[PDB]
Amino acid sequence: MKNSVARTQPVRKYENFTLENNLPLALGANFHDDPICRDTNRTSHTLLLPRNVDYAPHTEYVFNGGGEPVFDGWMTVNFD
Amino acid sequence: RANREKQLLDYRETYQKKETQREWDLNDPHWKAKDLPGRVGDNDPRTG
Amino acid sequence: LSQPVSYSLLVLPPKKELRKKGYNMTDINTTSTRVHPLARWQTHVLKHGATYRDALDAVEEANTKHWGFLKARIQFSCGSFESFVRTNPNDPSTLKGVSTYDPNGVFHKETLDCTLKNRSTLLPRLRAIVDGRGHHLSGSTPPARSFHPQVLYKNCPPPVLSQAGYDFTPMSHNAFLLRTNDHPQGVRDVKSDFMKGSCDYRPRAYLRDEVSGGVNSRHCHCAEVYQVGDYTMDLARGAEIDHRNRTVNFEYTKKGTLKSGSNIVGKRHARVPRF
Amino acid sequence: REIVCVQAGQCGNQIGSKFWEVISDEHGVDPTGTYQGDSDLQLERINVYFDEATGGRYVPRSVLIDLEPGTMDSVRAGPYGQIFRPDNFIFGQSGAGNNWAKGHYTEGAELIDSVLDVCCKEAESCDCLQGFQICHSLGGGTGSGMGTLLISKLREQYPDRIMMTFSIIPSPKVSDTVVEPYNTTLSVHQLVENSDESMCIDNEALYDICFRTLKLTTPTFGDLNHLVSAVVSGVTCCLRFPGQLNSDLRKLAVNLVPFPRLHFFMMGFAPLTSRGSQQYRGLSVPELTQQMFDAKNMMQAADPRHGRYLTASALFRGRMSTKEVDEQMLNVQNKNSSYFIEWIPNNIKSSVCDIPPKGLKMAVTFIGNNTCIQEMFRRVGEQFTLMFRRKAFLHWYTGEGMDEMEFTEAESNMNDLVSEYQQYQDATIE
Amino acid sequence: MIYSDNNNPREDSVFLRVKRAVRCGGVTGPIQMVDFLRDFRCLEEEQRASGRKGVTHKQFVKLMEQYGTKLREGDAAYLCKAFDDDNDGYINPERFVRHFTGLNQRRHNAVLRAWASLPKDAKGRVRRNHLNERFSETVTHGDVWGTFSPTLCFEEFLAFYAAVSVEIPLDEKFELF
Amino acid sequence: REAICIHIGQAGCQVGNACWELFCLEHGIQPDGAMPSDKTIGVEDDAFNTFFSETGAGKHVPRAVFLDLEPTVVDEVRTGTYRQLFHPEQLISGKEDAANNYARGHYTIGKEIVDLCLDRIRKLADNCTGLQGFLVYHAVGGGTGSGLGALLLERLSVDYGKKSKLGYTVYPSPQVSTAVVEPYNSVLSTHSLLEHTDVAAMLDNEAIYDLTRRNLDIERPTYTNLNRLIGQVVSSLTASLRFDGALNVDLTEFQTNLVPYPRIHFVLTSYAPVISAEKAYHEQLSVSEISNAVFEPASMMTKCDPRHGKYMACCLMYRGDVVPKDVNAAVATIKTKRTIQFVDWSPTGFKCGINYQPPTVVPGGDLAKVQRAVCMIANSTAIAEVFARIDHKFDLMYSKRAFVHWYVGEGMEEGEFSEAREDLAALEKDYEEVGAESADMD
Amino acid sequence: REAICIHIGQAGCQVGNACWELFCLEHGIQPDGAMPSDKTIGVEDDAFNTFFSETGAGKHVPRAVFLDLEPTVVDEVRTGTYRQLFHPEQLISGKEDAANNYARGHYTIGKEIVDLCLDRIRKLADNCTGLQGFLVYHAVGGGTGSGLGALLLERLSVDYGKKSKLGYTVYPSPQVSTAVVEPYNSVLSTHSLLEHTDVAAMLDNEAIYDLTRRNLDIERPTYTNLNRLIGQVVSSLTASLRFDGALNVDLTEFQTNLVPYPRIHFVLTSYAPVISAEKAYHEQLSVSEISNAVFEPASMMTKCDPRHGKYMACCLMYRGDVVPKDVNAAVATIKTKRTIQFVDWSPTGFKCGINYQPPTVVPGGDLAKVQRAVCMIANSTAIAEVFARIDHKFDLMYSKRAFVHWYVGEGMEEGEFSEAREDLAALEKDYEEVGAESADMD
Amino acid sequence: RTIYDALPKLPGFSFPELNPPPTNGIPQLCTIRKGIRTVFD
Numbered sequence A: 001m002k003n004s005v006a007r008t009q010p011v012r013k014y015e016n017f018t019l020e021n022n023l024p025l026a027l028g029a030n031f032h033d034d035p036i037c038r039d040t041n042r043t044s045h046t047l048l049l050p051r052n053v054d055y056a057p058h059t060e061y062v063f064n065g066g067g068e069p070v071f072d073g074w075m076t077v078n079f080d
Numbered sequence B: 001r002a003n004r005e006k007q008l009l010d011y012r013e014t015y016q017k018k019e020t021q022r023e024w025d026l027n028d029p030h031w032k033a034k035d036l037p038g039r040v041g042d043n044d045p046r047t048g
Numbered sequence C: 001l002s003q004p005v006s007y008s009l010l011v012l013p014p015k016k017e018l019r020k021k022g023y024n025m026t027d028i029n030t031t032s033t034r035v036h037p038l039a040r041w042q043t044h045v046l047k048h049g050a051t052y053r054d055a056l057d058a059v060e061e062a063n064t065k066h067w068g069f070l071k072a073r074i075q076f077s078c079g080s081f082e083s084f085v086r087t088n089p090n091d092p093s094t095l096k097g098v099s100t101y102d103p104n105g106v107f108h109k110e111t112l113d114c115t116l117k118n119r120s121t122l123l124p125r126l127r128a129i130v131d132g133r134g135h136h137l138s139g140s141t142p143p144a145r146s147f148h149p150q151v152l153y154k155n156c157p158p159p160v161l162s163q164a165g166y167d168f169t170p171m172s173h174n175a176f177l178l179r180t181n182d183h184p185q186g187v188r189d190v191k192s193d194f195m196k197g198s199c200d201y202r203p204r205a206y207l208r209d210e211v212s213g214g215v216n217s218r219h220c221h222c223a224e225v226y227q228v229g230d231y232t233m234d235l236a237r238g239a240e241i242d243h244r245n246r247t248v249n250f251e252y253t254k255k256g257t258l259k260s261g262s263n264i265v266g267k268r269h270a271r272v273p274r275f
Numbered sequence D: 001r002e003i004v005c006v007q008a009g010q011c012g013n014q015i016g017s018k019f020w021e022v023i024s025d026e027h028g029v030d031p032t033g034t035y036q037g038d039s040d041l042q043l044e045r046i047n048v049y050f051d052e053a054t055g056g057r058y059v060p061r062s063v064l065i066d067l068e069p070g071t072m073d074s075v076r077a078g079p080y081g082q083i084f085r086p087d088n089f090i091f092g093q094s095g096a097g098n099n100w101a102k103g104h105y106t107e108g109a110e111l112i113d114s115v116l117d118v119c120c121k122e123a124e125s126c127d128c129l130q131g132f133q134i135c136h137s138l139g140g141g142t143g144s145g146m147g148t149l150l151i152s153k154l155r156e157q158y159p160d161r162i163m164m165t166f167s168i169i170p171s172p173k174v175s176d177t178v179v180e181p182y183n184t185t186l187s188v189h190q191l192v193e194n195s196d197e198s199m200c201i202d203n204e205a206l207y208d209i210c211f212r213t214l215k216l217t218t219p220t221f222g223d224l225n226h227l228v229s230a231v232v233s234g235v236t237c238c239l240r241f242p243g244q245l246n247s248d249l250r251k252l253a254v255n256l257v258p259f260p261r262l263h264f265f266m267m268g269f270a271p272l273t274s275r276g277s278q279q280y281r282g283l284s285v286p287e288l289t290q291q292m293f294d295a296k297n298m299m300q301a302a303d304p305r306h307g308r309y310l311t312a313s314a315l316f317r318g319r320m321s322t323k324e325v326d327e328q329m330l331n332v333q334n335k336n337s338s339y340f341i342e343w344i345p346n347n348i349k350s351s352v353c354d355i356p357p358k359g360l361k362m363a364v365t366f367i368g369n370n371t372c373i374q375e376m377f378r379r380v381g382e383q384f385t386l387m388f389r390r391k392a393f394l395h396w397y398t399g400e401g402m403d404e405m406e407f408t409e410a411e412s413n414m415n416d417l418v419s420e421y422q423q424y425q426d427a428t429i430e
Numbered sequence E: 001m002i003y004s005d006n007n008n009p010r011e012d013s014v015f016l017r018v019k020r021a022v023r024c025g026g027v028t029g030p031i032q033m034v035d036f037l038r039d040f041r042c043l044e045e046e047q048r049a050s051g052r053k054g055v056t057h058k059q060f061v062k063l064m065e066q067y068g069t070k071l072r073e074g075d076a077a078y079l080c081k082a083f084d085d086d087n088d089g090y091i092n093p094e095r096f097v098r099h100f101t102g103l104n105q106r107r108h109n110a111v112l113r114a115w116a117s118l119p120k121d122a123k124g125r126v127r128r129n130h131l132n133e134r135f136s137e138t139v140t141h142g143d144v145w146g147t148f149s150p151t152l153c154f155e156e157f158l159a160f161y162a163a164v165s166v167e168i169p170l171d172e173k174f175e176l177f
Numbered sequence F, G: 001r002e003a004i005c006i007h008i009g010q011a012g013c014q015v016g017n018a019c020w021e022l023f024c025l026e027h028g029i030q031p032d033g034a035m036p037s038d039k040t041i042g043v044e045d046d047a048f049n050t051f052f053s054e055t056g057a058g059k060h061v062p063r064a065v066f067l068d069l070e071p072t073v074v075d076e077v078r079t080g081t082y083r084q085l086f087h088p089e090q091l092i093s094g095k096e097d098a099a100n101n102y103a104r105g106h107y108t109i110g111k112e113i114v115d116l117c118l119d120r121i122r123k124l125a126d127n128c129t130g131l132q133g134f135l136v137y138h139a140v141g142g143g144t145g146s147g148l149g150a151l152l153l154e155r156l157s158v159d160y161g162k163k164s165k166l167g168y169t170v171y172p173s174p175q176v177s178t179a180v181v182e183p184y185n186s187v188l189s190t191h192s193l194l195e196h197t198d199v200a201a202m203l204d205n206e207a208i209y210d211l212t213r214r215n216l217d218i219e220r221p222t223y224t225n226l227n228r229l230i231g232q233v234v235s236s237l238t239a240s241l242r243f244d245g246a247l248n249v250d251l252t253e254f255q256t257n258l259v260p261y262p263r264i265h266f267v268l269t270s271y272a273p274v275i276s277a278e279k280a281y282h283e284q285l286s287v288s289e290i291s292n293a294v295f296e297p298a299s300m301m302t303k304c305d306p307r308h309g310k311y312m313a314c315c316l317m318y319r320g321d322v323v324p325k326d327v328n329a330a331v332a333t334i335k336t337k338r339t340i341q342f343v344d345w346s347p348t349g350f351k352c353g354i355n356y357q358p359p360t361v362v363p364g365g366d367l368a369k370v371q372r373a374v375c376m377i378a379n380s381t382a383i384a385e386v387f388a389r390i391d392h393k394f395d396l397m398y399s400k401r402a403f404v405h406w407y408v409g410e411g412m413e414e415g416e417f418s419e420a421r422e423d424l425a426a427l428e429k430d431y432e433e434v435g436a437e438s439a440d441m442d
Numbered sequence H: 001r002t003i004y005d006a007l008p009k010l011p012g013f014s015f016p017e018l019n020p021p022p023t024n025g026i027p028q029l030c031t032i033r034k035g036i037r038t039v040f041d
């Protein structure tokens, strides 16, 4: 698209969903396709728009697993 | 990027005003309203 | 054409060392192509002025230099070589080479006829037809000058000029007329981004005389038929195209140059009106 | 077993900067030259691309050549620029002007002795020398002329080593330079005689990689040069790390080139995938093989479906079984049997290396020898014939001094190369 | 440069020269910028008290000359027309304040995050004595304590840290700093 | 790295004033010749070097000469705002004008001044280490611009060698006119200029007036506007030497790509985002839109229509925030159009350049501020109509010997008229023949 | 996805004001196109893109051109409330009108103005990626609307080719009339429109006056009411592109379904819940009631009675809270009616569309608020009666050459009158032939 | 050290504008002089 680059895929509600309400997907009970159960009818080109993400990154990635005695004569003996 | 272009628009709106241009005295509308005729009265200093 | 660049030598160790290792002095002659286990390869560099003659002299010098020597190889700059062997083993003064190998022998032999066919085709085309000053030769003059109305606008609409929007001498405008959807042979379907393909915007003159009744008004002269100089141009009567806006026919000259299409249909014999 | 790199012209110097960034990252070399890596396995083969300097420092076995220092001054000013040895920068005082004859004959012969002196100083310092590696564009001026000059001189001086080139070639759709057909034809004529193995890349194919596979919104030349740096550093990976089935540049050449003129290859690199898609597919050897043969992932405009593979090679990086590699290469050869030349019983060589690039579980680089490359040369020869009949722009080249017979010889030799590919494509046992 | 690149598109050359003059004049530069903002606010307050709707052009250029701006031919009128919105001989305060303490998006967000970190009381305003001992060993630029009038508001904070922005040419380094 | 600018006559000096105003403001050199107070040896700051050299005290001075025969314009420079910027030796002035006579400039008056000019240029060229061409500004309509410009280019061409000479030239407009004798001076100038220039870029004041009326919202434009547009185009073309970019372009590359045959060196120039601040907020200004803009004849700075000819080569310069894929997509879209035609012997029609520095904004200016721009110079057979229209006016005047006694009196043989007119006839025939399709030539 | 609107002359610009008012308020773009000072984007979603494009700063600008020969109406647009919405280049105005002469618009003046219009439309079409047609609003009764609309459609048809062109056309009412010369202009327009339009929808002001008297409660209607109704119709037809629905309908599907033979492309239009606020709360408004409503002649926006002809195809667009089973039951009941007849060669007479977005309410409007609406465009042989009456009035005037000297003076041959009259006679015979039963011809 | 550079060098993981250059000029770090090349920093 050639519009503003700050746009993101919108959020849809689709209320009255049987699978989310501890109910079987019975015949003649597809309420989430009823237009009264939506919040908007505006079509948005989701196949071109990106998605929204919010998180605090990891700041670091690991790739390894984390893991005078000179002689000047004077020989002395110690049994340690 | 979006805020970049918004700030560019701010710059355009505030520093590039139309009356700022050097050639405003020629391109100004109402330029004949602000000027004077050749001679005004009979004691006009401009009429040498 | 080619010149020698190096000569290769295969030798045996000295006689005393060969006896010390335990290998028999005799029984070196055999009909097999294999070599003795103690034979070592060494190479030497020839100078710039070297030719075949002095290289062969150096090979003969190596032959007479020391015992334990029956193999030779002279390498040219083209990658080819020939070998020299003794006809009678352990006997000098019988050296004679019967061999010639190059890496491109069978390769060139097998690809011969196609190479000559393509060479006979292409080389006549490479001949210059223009003087170094950018001027045509005395033969095969063009039938008309370039800036003539029908030559310059043979397959392109002429511009339209108008005074609107200008204070001085007017200038024309660009158009959106696309070209034929033709692609090079054997190229992947490339899109750097979303392009406007020419499969759509197919002209409405395609099959107009068959599925429709053809032109039924004089308004074709407003945007489709042009009077260029002494002739007539029609945008509906050009090169034939298919249903997907692709050229159908390709034509060539005697020497094999692609010939562009023409929209010029007819000549208008204009005369000033007199009594 | 150490390689010496040469970077020539603007394209070559820019790709080289990204290559040496990737290599310095894989071996943990700080841009100051200090080793900061995290396993001994990195150090024990560092010699392959780096020479050892005395104190805490490493120096890269590379020669930089250009006719005007502008690119060199930009790369030297870059974040990794300090690593390069100052004495290794060779430059003139006026540009090539994108003209082959100028780049080859006037400033070329002026600089070439100092370039050869630097290359010899670097080569004779090695304890055992492997092949040279050269990056340049064929459409340019100093890249084409001085690159092919230097290649010819090194082939005279080092005929027993390997000569390998990475080369940028004109797109079929849009030109970057008006005079590309002359420079390309003369350079291909020089290369087919001099080179042992040459890889060709279209910028248009990299654009299609970026747009279709990675779906990047705003790609930059850094991304294209990163893709190239990835494949170049991948082909040599088995040279410099342990593995279950070692491979080498000479062994690759021996398995890939059936006849000495047929040495032009296509390249690809597999684990390319958009930031949105990675959640949808785990890495496995079938997935890598499928991407490996998809023409979407190939860096040339010619498509395999119009030709046949004589030979191909796949180098795998990662911890994996040999059974899946062998059986995948068998299954691909069996299922697509019409696209493989039938008088060779097995066209694919495989190789396996234990250590993948950081942050990927597995990777493969693909090298392919396919007859469909003949159509690209045919297109360039056509455009050359179109220009030559009209003597297009010819006075520049003739004014430098070239004989026209050079142009007719180079055109004839390239035309014979296309004919030779066409004959072997349609050959039969009979 | 700073007024030509895409990273900072709001900058203008002559206003950059004015800011350079008011910063490098003469008590360090950021202190001078905070003082300039304070004088502008008190002047506009006095004018509002008198019964006139804002600072005029003449006292604006007088203030600029007082802080030591070596102006040229026609630049004073350029700035006077630039910040006059209604075109009636008056200078808009909000536009001038927004331009005076201007910053890039990343730098502005860094300043906002830092300001949100500190605690406030009463009407959103900080005090020096409550927090001078807590952050004594970590504030390298000790001029902040001199900026306190032991009180400080967000506009002075933003002006102070916009003054120091010229010393750090990298945005990431500014954020971490 | 270095380039030397030569400014000749009235138009060339006034355009030079606008250019050096622009180059100062873009690099940051103050009018008194001083780097701003925040720049030191702390960071590497050398981009000016293409156009300025610094003295041992750190003052900057520019690599230019200003040439005039009348004092008034150079005395205006001497008394103007930039008095301290220029070295006084650089501003050279004679006593009296060439009175619209090419012959007076070339034979009588320019021969006296020319040796000082060559000595000054030599003194500049000795203080260089990578000079890579001359930029020349002159008008061919006036006497001193034609005569001294030709004489000076001839002398430079003898003294220097293998060095590029790029001209920006103001030609006589096809119906706007300033003097009666314009055809004679333009013919004789173009005759001398033909042998001794590598690429010539053509400008017409009537076209730039139309452009300032059409694109900008100026009812009563004057030469300062025109000169600011010219300064922007030259800054765009020379930006490739001075700032970082993806694809740089040296001045020698223009001649290699644009000139197919040694006489065929006249090119068209256009500039895309000529736009006012009020229009700028109604429109996005993407790469493809400005690329589409440079091909409209309404964008051109010379009054010729390229639809009456065929293109041989185009050179497209992009500066600012552009990505190579968009440049490739734009050029590929242009190539599809049917009303844009290239000669069949030129298949690879395009040269590209990509630079990161966006165009600078001048305080009094009328152009908007924009993040990206594209500039085009192109070679096309349509130029034959410009010469043909000048030649018809020459034939009309010479048929009656309308003014010849002036030219013969100031020192020129009458024969020179016939020689020049025959050379322009041959140039017309070159442009007729070159446009002939190869398939018809067999 | 995107569509470009072309508004011509007085009716087309005035209807454009109502259309863009509605499309702004329905999508949510402010009348000036700006956004609140704290938001980063004015709206969350791209759905506007069919009719508006946003700049990178988020201002909205609409995909339209306004074409007129007199300045006054466009100057009213320039000074009105929507000043900031339109780009100033889009608002094109000439100096003087076409003076009710088709010849003056087509030959003399529109021929001068047309190239600017084509350049603006091209500039729009270059900023698109899935253009799927042109929408044109004009009246055929006046001089510039007829002449320049025809000339522009001819040029568009050559340049863009296969792309669809859908016209909304105001034809001369059968007894209300405004000018004497209406028949000549309407005949010559229809002659040009036959070759160069894919579907043409015809409107008559007398029908919309009748509709506003009976259904709405307006004693003194004016053109703004009619234009708001037209805007609602256009919004209903284009809603299928812009909002979610069960059965979408792309603009290319209309031409495929409605036109049996290439000349038979003139369609009738009607709209169901045209109702006042006081009536709306006295009645339920179910699907079957509005489906029954659309076939009554009291609902039509063109003054023709379809009971005097035969339908060839119908396209029914439902928007709002409708369920498919009720649409199917309604259409089967309509099919049952005896005063509705289809030609025996067209058994599958219907195309359906179903969209979920209910019609928008405009602050100053006169329509009630309703949950659902249906709009129909249909092809019927009854249309032949309108042409027969225009042709008879033309024949009456032309028998004495009553006004022809104006047309001949403005550039037209007298022969063009007779040619157009035989073509319209042949169109009448086509409508006679297409309507002949196949069972009767055996 | 920071979340802006804590990613491996793989294609598609580079964000060029996050590290914008403070300047766009060309230094003269590579000169010829009288024929003695200098690569001074």
Ligand SMILES: Nc1nc2c(ncn2[C@@H]2O[C@H](COP(=O)(O)OP(=O)(O)OP(=O)(O)O)[C@@H](O)[C@H]2O)c(=O)[nH]1
Binding pocket: F008, F009, F010, F011, F012, F014, F015, F069, F070, F097, F098, F099, F100, F101, F139, F141, F142, F143, F144, F145, F146, F170, F172, F178, F205, F223, F226, F227
């Ligand atoms: N674009 C532009 N054109 C100019 C300018 N000054 C003069 N011209 C044009 O150039 C032509 C006049 O040439 P001049 O430069 O005055 O001639 P000259 O070089 O002074 O020659 P002499 O009169 O002999 O001194 C006319 O066509 C003018 O319109 C200018 O500043 N800008």
Ligand SMILES: Nc1nc2c(ncn2[C@@H]2O[C@H](COP(=O)(O)OP(=O)(O)OP(=O)(O)O)[C@@H](O)[C@H]2O)c(=O)[nH]1
Binding pocket: G008, G009, G010, G011, G012, G014, G015, G069, G070, G097, G098, G099, G100, G101, G139, G141, G142, G143, G144, G145, G146, G170, G172, G178, G205, G223, G226, G227
């Ligand atoms: N429905 C409707 N009809 C209109 C409107 N304006 C004018 N008309 C009708 O259209 C016809 C007049 O056409 P105009 O648009 O005035 O003609 P024009 O395009 O201005 O042509 P010129 O007079 O030559 O300038 C008459 O039948 C009017 O009743 C309008 O706003 N709405």
Ligand SMILES: Nc1nc2c(ncn2[C@@H]2O[C@H](COP(=O)(O)OP(=O)(O)O)[C@@H](O)[C@H]2O)c(=O)[nH]1
Binding pocket: D008, D009, D010, D011, D012, D014, D015, D096, D098, D137, D139, D140, D141, D142, D143, D144, D168, D176, D177, D203, D221, D224, D225, F246, F247
């Ligand atoms: N992939 C890639 N191509 C490049 C790069 N730089 C230049 N090119 C291409 O190489 C060609 C220009 O050759 P160039 O390097 O300028 O030749 P030179 O003047 O001899 O150095 C054009 O096709 C450019 O698109 C780069 O960094 N990456």
Ligand SMILES: [Mg+2]
Binding pocket: F009, F010, F070, F097, F142, F144
């Ligand atoms: Mg003068």
Ligand SMILES: [Mg+2]
Binding pocket: G009, G010, G070, G097
């Ligand atoms: Mg009117």
Ligand SMILES: [Zn+2]
Binding pocket: C219, C222, G106, G150, G151, G154
């Ligand atoms: Zn017509």
